[PDB]
């Protein structure tokens, strides 16, 4: 096997219309985790 | 001499470290002169010599330590 | 009424760490009172040597441990 | 069915190239969480008094401890020390793959469970409260009751042993897989640095393993290892911890040294001044950065002679680093400079910040001087202005410099430069006022402060906000680069000299580079170096 | 570190008071175990050399 | 060629193997048996037991620390707990 | 003595070691400002003028240090010796012990500070001890300083030198006061011996630094100097 | 008795990965994978019980 890389190693397919919402939602939830973390310690208070 | 032995058994740790270093150096000098003897094998033989000398000097020291008059 | 007198410049240990001094003064005072007598003057100054610098709060637990005899000292 | 191919190419794959990308991604997902933690803690101290919270001091302790631990052990070490080494070291040594592929595959996957268990531990009823440097009595079952800090201890243990296991194969790879005719002396500076960090980390971390395990056993087996009534001395714990902590920052920052020494010449088109002197001074730094450990115990109350012995030697560290900075300054002058390039921008901005941070570090290396700054905001300013200005800048420069080799795409120069400027300004106005806050004589790790400190905290908060926009812009530029299909040539950083014809250069000059990695196509082959490159013996 | 500088509740001796007489004597079963280990190493070296001798 | 060198190496290895067999069956055995006899003498000398002592400054305040319950059993037993050498 | 707003210097204080520390800091800052501005100007000038559009030719054939590396080794090392020496004689002055007069004890368990003056034990058999506590925000006196006052304030006479005793019986604390420049670690089990000497008669402020749990920021320390007659009246008051 | 050469030649004829080259290896991994999946499913509930302060009774 002698394949030529297409200069594309993104771990997941990317394109304009649809995947943008998925990427932005993942970014938002991984940004906002600390929020639920800080809310958990002050739940029963 | 009744005084040399007092210092010989007073400080067992420093003299034992010195004789261990002497044995290590002498064994390294003697062993590292042959052809059919690689460096790890000669080091192992030197360390075995050191272990034997350490055991015998340990038995000698624990034998002479009873003289605590 | 009052004078400025306490533990002097301890020549045994001049460094910052002087934790062993309290225990040394305690055991030395106990050895001193065990021998000699009781009303003798000199070790009354040794009595001050483990109260001025010691917290005196560990002294209560020291008394509790020593009263039952479990105190681990030669004297 | 590409699903089997998908998971064989990603999960059941041991190629070095397919792993460093995951290293970068894991570093990124740790760094975002850490940056948000830092933002929340800095927003807490915007104004005096309980703010956005019900005065929860334990929550603030959890936040600071989590930020510190996750950003020191999940952001910079795994995404810089081995991320840019496992991918690149085989390229510069002349080998097709690392010595032990299976251990290389194994080391990466010990980290995700560590992150999950650390998050679970922080999600307990109390959470870790000892800070980045947890201390035995505070960690004692007396204060914390639950599985909060034990899991943090376990995470530190397993991350350390994984990093040690992730550095055993590298040394063998760069000591035995050398190219024919490539003497160890003639090795490039970057791999020299990375090997020095590997050997230092492997030599030191076992001590942490043993000390951390024996300290943790106090909570379960009720050992008297560090109990004040049990005969244990916590100063022993401090000595054990700071026999590791002091060289850790150096082994973290040496890859930044190597990446700067690599970025400067290629974008300056001038060979590095005094390679042998620089590498020997760096070796002197590596050997020197072990016998000095008690500068973190200046106000504990040790003896005079020990304090003098371990404070006098703190100064001698500066001399080789100053020599390195002077050598880089000499290299910059004379040769051509393309100051508009983003890697050049980061390399230039690294030097001034690193040297001012080093000056701050040499400020407080004296027992006579540390008493006025020990455990105050001044040490916070020093160590932050060194860490986040050197290691973060080196990581950003390395990413922006070797990204086409990792993937084969081009980023947006305008947005990257804007991000660099915004981040530089924000981080300069974040740690600036803290110098004055610590110079006034006000301690660190305090959610509340006396009223006469509000102004500098207010000045720091705006920069803390600005850093978040910098992060957002970096995320946008990364996404754009990933989905812009902008092609890249073999050696994008090679340009014709002043006397190269436009037809002679294109046909009789291509395929030449100062380093091996630029000789191959930007998306590198799975099996490179079919035959060993042979130099002049 | 735990031995060279004992705490001041230890009686100024690294061997604990009352437990010092309960320590391990130098001449007992562990010494026999050490000599067994030394002879085991000698036998293993003999086996390795004989294996070298095919 | 290979024959002479392999013969010399095998001869040296065989001589060393014979010497090591003499070592392991000449001096190691006597030392082992002497140590075993001395150990048996020491073990048999002290067969008086009397390993139940109390009221002579008991506890010493740093014995059997219980801050977290021991996982095995009720919580007051260790893995190698003994009814004759372990007391309270 | 107390923090101000928009402060740039450290503060105005009164302690024999504090003045020497400030002097050493001034000398060291004078040393480092030189190098900082020099390196900044070098970095700026080596790039602002040598951009590619103005310097298309690079003198790539100079990669040897003939006499420059030696001066690099010497001159900053000379500066290093010049800064090390004054700090060394300052430290070798401080490590000595003056003539002892009296001692104080600063044992503190958790979120409060206890002080003892057991030097004056006499027939009265009433050693003086108390506990300094965080004053609540609501009960602050009109015009008081938030987060920097205590109810049972410590009292030490002026111009008298005290060999302070530092001890703790809980998680490690610290005993800090920037005006006096004296600090040490409240390490449990072991006692730390520190000295002190006040020149003026004024109120001094400070607090701990080493974190000791949730309320690490709730034990301010206030020590104020008093004259001999005021000191005697205070002592006979209790 | 020395069957290592015969079995070597027998086993070199297949193109399977080295972790499945020897016949009968597949039967020791599929139930192993099922047991690992069950362990993960149980540990999910275990961790969820640990974080949420409570104990079954
Ligand atoms: C990130 C990497 C890093 C680097 C490179 C350094 C560099 C140095 N650090 Fe720092 N340091 C940390 C990370 C780092 N440090 C961290 C994380 C902590 C806190 C630990 C914690 O609490 O967890 C810390 C804390 C710390 C302390 C503890 C203070 C306290 O808390 O009480 C001390 C004290 O000695 C110290 C010293 C030094 C010194 C002497 C250097 C020297 O290497 C600096 C040398 C550099 C220069 C000086 C500039 C270049 C030189 C020249 C231009 C030559 C000419 C100069 C002169 C003659 C003036 N560091
Ligand atoms: C790895 C080192 C590191 C880094 C990078 C940081 C980053 C930051 N730290 Fe932290 N910090 C520590 C190490 C670090 N810190 C340590 C050891 C402690 C002590 C813990 C203890 O006390 O227990 C500490 C504690 C600490 C405190 C103590 C709280 C208190 O005492 O009151 C504060 C508060 O100001 C703070 C602030 C910050 C800020 C604002 C940033 C940053 O926001 C500054 C700007 C940086 C960024 C905003 C991130 C940029 C990232 C990118 C652009 C993404 C790149 C991604 C890739 C391509 C993979 N840090
Ligand atoms: C940090 C201190 C802890 C102790 C250090 C040991 C760490 C665990 C052991 C890892 C092996 C070390 C290298 C051996 C040499 C080598 O390389 O073995 C070779 C292989 C890799 O090389 P290769 O086959 O590709 O070579 C090519 C051959 N020509 O190794 C392995 O497959 C390791 C086996 C997997 C084990 C990983 C799981 C580790 C469990 C850790 C928990 C147990 C310890 C807990 C401690 C509290
Ligand atoms: C703390 C600060 C204190 C500073 C004290 C240091 C004073 C001495 C330093 C000056 C020595 C170097 C001068 C060159 C003399 C010479 O003429 O050298 C000879 C060579 C000439 O080229 P050639 O070798 O090819 O000649 C071939 C003969 N046939 O020059 C050079 O190549 C210069 C190239 C490297 C020098 C760049 C300097 C960059 C900054 C240096 C440090 C800046 C300090 C900033 C803070 C003040
Ligand atoms: C996974 C790795 C775990 C083992 C690591 C080994 C490391 C060696 C150095 C550490 C010292 C160990 C000594 C204790 C041995 C012992 O048995 O302790 C002694 C006690 C009982 O003895 P006794 O009082 O009766 O003795 C007096 C005789 N009359 O038994 C125990 O407490 C059992 C538990 C000890 C731990 C060993 C088994 C580990 C299982 C849990 C794994 C924990 C993982 C932690 C997080 C990774
Ligand atoms: Cu008291 Cu920190
Ligand atoms: Ca606040
Ligand atoms: Mg401290």
Domain extent, residue C46, equals 1-75
Which residue from E26, E38, E42 is facing B62, i.e. has the nearest CB?
Answer: E26
Q: How far apart are CA C65 and CA C53, in angstroms?
A: 21
Q: Which token pair is B55?
A: 């055991």
**D408: Cβ–Cβ under 8 A, 6 or more apart, which residues?**
A5, A7, A8, A9, D487, D488, D522, D523
Q: What is the DSSP letter of G102?
A: B
**G118: Cβ–Cβ under 8 A, 6 or more apart, which residues?**
C51, C52, C56, G103, G105, G127, G128
Residue G173 annotated as binding site: yes
The DSSP line for D113-175 is HHHHHHHHHHTSSS---S-SS--HHHHSTTT--SSSHHHHHHHHHHHHHHHHHHHHHHHHHHH
CATH of the domain at D58: 1.20.210.10
Q: Is residue D158 part of a domain?
A: yes
Per the DSSP assignment, residues forming a β-bridge with G116 are: G105, G129
Domain extent, residue D466, equals 2-518
Q: How far apart are CA D412 and CA D92, in angstroms?
A: 28
How far away, in angstroms, is D148 Cα from ligand 2 center?
Answer: 22
Q: How far apart are CA D442 and CA D455, in angstroms?
A: 14
Say what angle helices D377-406 and D234-268 make with each other, to 10 degrees: 40
* Number of domains, chain D: 1
Q: How far apart are CA D267 and CA D408, in angstroms?
A: 19
- Show the beta-strand stretches assigned E in chain B: none
CA distance G237 to chain C (A): 14
Say what angle helices F28-45 and E29-52 make with each other, to 10 degrees: 160
CB D419 within 8 A of CB D470: yes
Q: Is residue D527 part of a domain?
A: no
Handedness of CA D300, D301, D302, D308 (dihedral sign): positive
Ligand nearest to the CA of D354: 1
CA distance B23 to chain E (A): 18
Q: How far apart are CA G131 and CA G152, in angstroms?
A: 6
Pairing of strands G182-186, G203-207: unpaired
**F64: Cβ–Cβ under 8 A, 6 or more apart, which residues?**
F88
CB D73 within 8 A of CB D121: no
Q: Tell me which chain F residue has its CA closest to the CA of residue C69.
A: F57
Domain boundaries, chain A: 1-45
CB D515 within 8 A of CB D188: yes
Chain breaks in chain C (C to N over 2.5 A) after: none
How many angstroms separate the Cα of D23 from the Cα of each of D83, D404, D523? 6, 17, 18
The DSSP line for D96-127 is SS-S-HHHHHHHHHTHHHHHHHHHHHHTSSS-
Per the DSSP assignment, residues forming a β-bridge with G205 are: G222
The values of phi and psi at residue G233, to 5°, are -65, -40
Q: How far apart are CA D182 and CA D93, in angstroms?
A: 8
CA distance E2 to chain C (A): 16
Residue D35: closest CA among G70, A27, G187, G74: A27
Q: How far is CA G112 from the centre of its chain?
A: 21
Determine whether the interchain pair E8/C72 forms a contact, defined as Cβ–Cβ distance below 8 Å.
no
Q: What is the 3-state secondary structure (H, E, C) of C9-50?
A: CCCCCCCCECCHHHHHHHHHHHHHHHCCCCCCCHHHHHHHCC
Give the resolution to one decimal, in Å: 3.4
Start-to-end CA distance of chain A, whole Å, equals: 63
Q: Tell me which chain D residue has its CA closest to the CA of residue A44.
A: D125
Q: How far apart are CA D220 and CA E12, in angstroms?
A: 29
Determine whether the interchain pair G217/D447 forms a contact, defined as Cβ–Cβ distance below 8 Å.
yes
Q: Which residue has the tokens 């010595």?
A: D99
Residue G212 annotated as binding site: yes
Which bin fits G182, alpha (ψ -120 to 50), beta or left (φ > 0)?
A: beta
Handedness of CA G150, G152, G157, G163 (dihedral sign): negative
Which residue from A8, A23, A34 is facing D40, i.e. has the nearest CB?
Answer: A34
Contacts 24+ apart (CB under 8 A), D105-111: D105/D13, D105/D14, D105/D19, D106/D165, D107/D82, D107/D162, D107/D163, D107/D165, D107/D166, D108/D19, D108/D22, D108/D23, D108/D26, D108/D166, D110/D158, D110/D159, D110/D161, D110/D162, D110/D165, D111/D26, D111/D74, D111/D78, D111/D159, D111/D162
SS3 at position G118? coil
Q: How far apart are CA F86 and CA F82, in angstroms?
A: 5
Residues of E in contact with B16 (CB under 8 A): none
Per the DSSP assignment, residues forming a β-bridge with A25 are: none
Taking CB atoms and a 6 Å cutoff, what residues make up the pocket around ligand 4? Answer: D 326, 329-330, 333; G 35, 38, 42, 62, 66, 68, 71, 75-76
Determine whether the interchain pair F57/C65 forms a contact, defined as Cβ–Cβ distance below 8 Å.
no
| H or E stretch covering F6 | helix F2-26
Vertex D291: Cα angle to D286 and D293 (nearest 5): 105
CA dihedral H2, H3, H8, H14 (to 10 degrees): 180
Q: How far apart are CA D219 and CA D145, in angstroms?
A: 10
* Number of domains, chain C: 1
CB D94 within 8 A of CB D27: no
* Number of domains, chain H: 1
Residue D493: closest CA among D422, D374, D401: D401
Domain extent, residue H52, equals 1-57
Which subunits count as partners of chain F given 3+ CB pairs below 8 Å?
A: B, C, D, E
Q: Is residue D537 part of a domain?
A: no
CB D12 within 8 A of CB D102: no
Q: Whose CA is nearest to atom 4 of ligand 4?
A: G75
Q: How far apart are CA C55 and CA G106, in angstroms?
A: 9
SS3 at position D187? coil
Residue D299: closest CA among D235, D357, D237: D235
CB G76 within 8 A of CB D319: yes
- Approach to solving: cryo-EM
Q: Please report the atom of ligand 1 found closest to the CA of residue D318.
A: 45
Q: Is residue D528 part of a domain?
A: no
């Amino acid at each position: 096997s002698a394949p030529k890389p297409g200069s594309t190693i993104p771990f997941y397919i990317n394109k304009k219309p649809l995947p943008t919402l998925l990427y932005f939602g993942t970014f938002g939830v991984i940004f906002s985790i600390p929020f639920i973390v800080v809310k958990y310690h002050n739940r029963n208070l | 001499n009744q005084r040399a032995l007092y210092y010989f058994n007073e400080h067992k740790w420093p003299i034992i470290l010195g004789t261990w270093a002497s044995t290590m150096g002498l064994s390294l000098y003697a062993a590292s002169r042959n052809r059919y003897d690689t460096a790890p094998q000669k080091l192992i033989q030197a360390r075995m010599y050191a272990q034997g000398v350490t055991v015998v000097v340990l038995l000698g020291s624990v034998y002479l330590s009873t003289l605590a008059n | 009424q009052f004078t400025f007198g306490t533990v002097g410049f301890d020549a045994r240990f001049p460094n910052t760490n002087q934790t062993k001094h309290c225990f040394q003064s305690y055991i030395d005072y106990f050895r001193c009172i065990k021998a000699k007598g009781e009303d003798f003057v000199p070790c009354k100054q040794f009595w001050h040597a483990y109260q001025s610098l010691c917290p005196m709060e560990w002294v209560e637990r020291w008394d509790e441990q020593r009263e039952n005899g479990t105190f681990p000292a030669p004297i | 069915n590409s699903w089997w191919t998908y998971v064989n190419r990603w999960i059941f794959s041991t190629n070095a190239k397919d792993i460093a990308i995951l290293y970068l991604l894991f570093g990124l997902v740790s760094g975002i969480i850490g940056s948000v933690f830092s933002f929340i803690i800095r927003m807490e101290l915007s104004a005096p008094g309980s703010q956005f919270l019900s005065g929860n001091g334990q929550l603030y302790n959890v936040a600071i401890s989590a930020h510190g631990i996750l950003m020191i052990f999940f952001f910079i070490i795994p995404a810089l020390f081995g991320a840019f080494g496992n991918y690149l070291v085989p390229l510069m040594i002349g080998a097709p793959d690392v010595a032990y592929p299976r251990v290389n595959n194994f080391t990466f996957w010990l980290l995700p469970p560590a992150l999950m268990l650390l998050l679970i531990s922080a999600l307990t009823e109390e959470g870790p409260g000892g800070g980045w440097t947890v201390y035995p009595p505070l960690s004692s079952i007396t204060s914390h009751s639950g599985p909060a800090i034990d899991l943090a201890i376990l995470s530190l243990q397993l991350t350390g042993i994984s990093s040690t296991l992730g550095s055993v194969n590298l040394i063998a790879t760069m000591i035995n897989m050398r190219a024919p005719g490539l003497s160890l002396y003639q090795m490039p500076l970057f791999a020299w640095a990375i090997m020095i960090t590997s050997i230092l980390l492997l030599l030191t971390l076992p001590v942490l393993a043993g000390g951390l395990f024996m300290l943790f056993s106090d909570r379960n087996l009720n050992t008297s290892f560090y109990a004040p009534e049990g005969g244990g001395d916590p100063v022993l714990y401090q000595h054990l911890f700071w026999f590791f902590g002091h060289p850790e920052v150096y082994i973290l920052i040496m890859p930044a040294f190597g990446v700067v020494s690599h970025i400067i010449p290629s974008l300056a088109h001038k060979p590095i001044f005094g390679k042998e002197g620089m590498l020997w001074a760096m070796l002197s730094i590596a050997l020197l950065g072990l016998m000095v450990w008690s500068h973190h115990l200046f106000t504990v109350g040790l003896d005079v002679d020990t304090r003098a012995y371990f404070s006098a030697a703190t100064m001698v560290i500066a001399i080789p680093t100053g020599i390195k900075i002077f050598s880089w300054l000499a290299t910059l002058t004379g040769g051509a400079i393309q100051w508009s390039r983003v890697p050049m921008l980061y390399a230039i901005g690294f030097l001034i910040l690193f040297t001012i941070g080093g000056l701050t570090g040499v400020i407080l290396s004296n027992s006579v001087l540390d008493i006025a700054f020990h455990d105050t905001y001044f040490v916070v300013a020093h160590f932050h202005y060194v860490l986040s200005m050197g290691a973060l800048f080196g990581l950003c420069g390395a990413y922006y410099y070797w990204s086409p080799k990792m993937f084969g795409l081009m980023y947006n120069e305008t947005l990257a430069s804007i991000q660099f400027w915004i981040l530089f300004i924000g981080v300069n106005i974040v740690f600036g006022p803290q110098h004055f806050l610590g110079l006034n004589g006000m301690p660190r790790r305090i959610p509340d402060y006396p009223e006469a400190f509000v102004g500098w905290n207010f000045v720091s908060s705006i920069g803390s906000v600005i850093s978040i926009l910098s992060l957002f812009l970096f995320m946008y530029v990364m996404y754009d680069q990933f989905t812009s299909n902008r092609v890249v040539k073999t050696n994008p950083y090679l340009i014709p000299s002043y006397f190269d014809d436009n037809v002679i250069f294109v046909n009789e000059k291509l395929g030449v580079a100062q380093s091996i990695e630029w000789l191959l196509h930007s998306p590198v082959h799975e099996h490179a170096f079919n035959t060993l490159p042979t130099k002049s013996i | 570190h735990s031995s060279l500088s004992p705490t001041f509740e230890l009686g100024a001796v690294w061997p604990p008071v009352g437990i010092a007489d309960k320590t391990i004597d130098p001449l007992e079963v562990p010494l026999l175990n050490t000599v067994i280990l030394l002879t085991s190493g000698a036998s293993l070296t003999y086996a390795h050399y004989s294996l070298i001798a095919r | 060629n290979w024959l002479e060198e392999v013969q010399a190496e095998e001869e040296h290895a065989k001589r060393s193997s014979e010497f090591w067999k003499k070592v392991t069956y000449y001096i190691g055995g006597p030392a082992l048996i002497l140590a075993s006899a001395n150990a048996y003498y020491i073990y048999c000398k002290h067969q008086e037991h009397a390993k139940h002592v109390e009221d002579t400054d008991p506890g010493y305040s740093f014995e059997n620390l219980r801050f977290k319950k021991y996982p095995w059993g009720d919580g007051s037993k260790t893995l190698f707990w003994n009814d004759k050498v372990n007391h309270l | 003595d107390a923090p101000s707003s928009w402060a740039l210097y450290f503060q105005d204080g009164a302690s024999p070691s504090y003045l020497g520390v400030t002097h050493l800091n001034d000398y060291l800052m004078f040393y480092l400002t030189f190098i900082f501005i020099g390196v900044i100007y070098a970095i700026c000038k080596a790039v602002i003028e040598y951009n590619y559009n103005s310097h298309p030719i690079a003198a790539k054939y100079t990669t040897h240090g003939s006499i420059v590396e030696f001066i690099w080794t010497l001159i900053p090392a000379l500066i290093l010796i010049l800064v090390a020496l004054p700090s060394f004689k300052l430290l070798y002055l401080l490590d000595e012990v003056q003539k002892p007069s009296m001692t104080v004890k600063a044992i503190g368990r958790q979120w409060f500070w206890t002080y003892e003056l057991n030097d004056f034990v006499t027939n009265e058999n009433e050693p003086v001890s108390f506990d300094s506590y965080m004053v609540p925000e609501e009960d602050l006196e009109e015009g008081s300083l938030r987060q920097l006052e205590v109810d049972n304030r410590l009292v030490l006479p002026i111009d008298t030198r005290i060999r302070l005793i530092l001890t703790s019986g809980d998680v490690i604390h610290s005993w800090a006061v920037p005006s006096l420049g004296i600090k040490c670690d409240c390490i449990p089990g072991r006692l730390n011996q520190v000295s002190l000497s006040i020149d003026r008669e004024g109120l001094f402020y400070g607090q701990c630094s080493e974190l000791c749990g949730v309320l690490h920021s709730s034990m301010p320390i206030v020590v104020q100097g008093v004259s001999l007659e005021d000191f005697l009246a205070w002592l006979e008051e209790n | 008795k020395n069957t290592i050469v015969q079995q070597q030649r027998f086993l070199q004829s297949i193109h399977k990965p080295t972790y499945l080259q020897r016949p009968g290896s597949f039967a020791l991994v599929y139930p192993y994978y099922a047991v690992m999946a069950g362990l993960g499913l149980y540990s999910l509930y275990a961790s969820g019980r640990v974080i949420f302060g409570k104990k079954d009774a």
